[PDB]
């Protein structure tokens, strides 16, 4: 992998999370958006797994 931004990003997040699904709880404070990791700088499938619920 290198960088992902559009439909590719949500599709590979769904693929890696699968049925466990996504985490959410509104902050409030933030580090940086998922795009500033996986699109602009460098993506990692070890990080995409951390937006999943588990």
């Amino acid at each position: 992998s290198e960088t992902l931004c559009g439909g590719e990003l949500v599709d590979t997040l769904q693929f890696v999370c699968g049925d466990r699904g996504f985490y959410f709880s509104r902050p409030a404070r933030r580090s940086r958006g998922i795009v500033e990791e996986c699109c602009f700088r460098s993506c990692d499938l070890a990080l995409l797994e951390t937006y999943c619920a588990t």
């Binding site: 290198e2 960088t3 931004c5 559009g6 590719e8 990003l9 949500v10 997040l13 996504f22 985490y23 959410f24 709880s25 509104r26 902050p27 958006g33 998922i34 795009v35 500033e36 699109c39 951390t50 937006y51 999943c52 619920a53 588990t54």
Partner: protein, 307 residues
């Protein structure tokens, strides 16, 4: 042989009809001050009225001449003497040309700038690869500083980086051609708005993209069967004629202008066997940017990392 000496030293040139005095001549025993702010068709006619000028016994100055994308209308010019020269000893000078894309075609146009140096400023599309090759080719490499050929304002706008679009397949026909190129995508595919393909008749393999503006432009997008290779059919062809064809990717511009390279093919020369609107030009660029930024904001907002 025919000389072009004139009662003015500085033959300013504001129009095609101002060059008339030069029509059919070679050696201009003076200096020039080109100031062609606006016009059209001019290159096809200056190449008649002054496309034989071969030697200039002085400086050349080129100022505010936004009307022309290239100097290649000086088809024949082999030599600048600089026997008369500007303050700061500039004997070639190119200033504030809002749209100057290239100088002469350094693949076969030789030249020399004998007795002086040169200055470039504010020409925003004339990127340095076109002019360092002039320092190399026109006998002037060591004569001037890189404040004279400044890095910052000159060439800022132009996309002078060049990923290459390899032609994956080609198909001649009795009256048609079909060509294909690989699945090029920038680092973030939404930057790619479409491809544009340029084609023209080119009986001799010396042609360049910056002909007078002469090319015919056609557009095609990345296919919806995203696995398949891009490609196009062109029907505007004729028997046995040879065409140049080349493809240029049309891409967004952003703060990533330093990184949205765009792409260009090499020119491929192929012989047959024996419209847009200028508003949607920009409006779909806006539409794709104003979509892309919202989709980024949406992904930044929706996702938050687990414990």
């Amino acid at each position: 042989p025919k000389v072009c000496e004139e009662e003015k030293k500085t033959k300013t040139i504001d129009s095609v009809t101002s060059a008339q005095m030069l029509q059919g001549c070679t050696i201009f025993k003076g200096n020039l001050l080109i100031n062609i702010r606006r016009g059209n068709n001019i290159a096809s006619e200056l190449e008649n009225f002054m496309g034989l000028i071969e030697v200039v016994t002085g400086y050349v100055k080129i100022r505010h001449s936004h009307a022309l994308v290239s100097l290649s209308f000086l088809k024949n010019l082999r030599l600048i003497l600089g026997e008369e020269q500007l303050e700061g000893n500039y004997s070639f000078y190119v200033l504030d040309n809002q749209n100057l894309q290239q100088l002469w075609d350094w693949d076969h146009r030789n030249l020399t700038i004998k007795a002086g140096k040169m200055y470039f400023a504010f020409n925003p599309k004339l990127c340095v690869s076109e002019i360092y090759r002039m320092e190399e080719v026109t006998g002037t490499k060591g004569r001037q500083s890189k404040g004279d050929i400044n890095t910052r304002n000159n060439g800022e706008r132009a996309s002078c980086e060049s990923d290459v679009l390899h032609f994956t397949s080609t198909t001649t026909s009795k009256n048609r051609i079909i060509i294909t190129w690989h699945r090029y995508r920038p680092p973030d595919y939404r930057d790619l708005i479409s491809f544009t393909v340029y084609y023209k008749e080119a009986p001799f393999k010396n042609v360049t993209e910056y002909d007078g503006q002469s090319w015919n432009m056609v557009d095609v997008d990345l296919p919806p069967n995203k696995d398949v290779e891009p490609g196009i059919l062109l029907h505007g062809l004729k028997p046995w004629t040879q065409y140049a064809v080349y493809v240029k990717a049309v891409t967004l511009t952003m703060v990533e202008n330093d990184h949205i390279r765009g792409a260009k093919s090499e020119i491929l020369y192929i012989r047959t066997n024996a419209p847009k609107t200028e508003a949607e030009k920009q409006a779909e660029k806006e539409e794709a940017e104003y979509r892309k930024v919202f989709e980024n904001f949406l992904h930044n907002s929706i996702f938050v990392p687990r414990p």
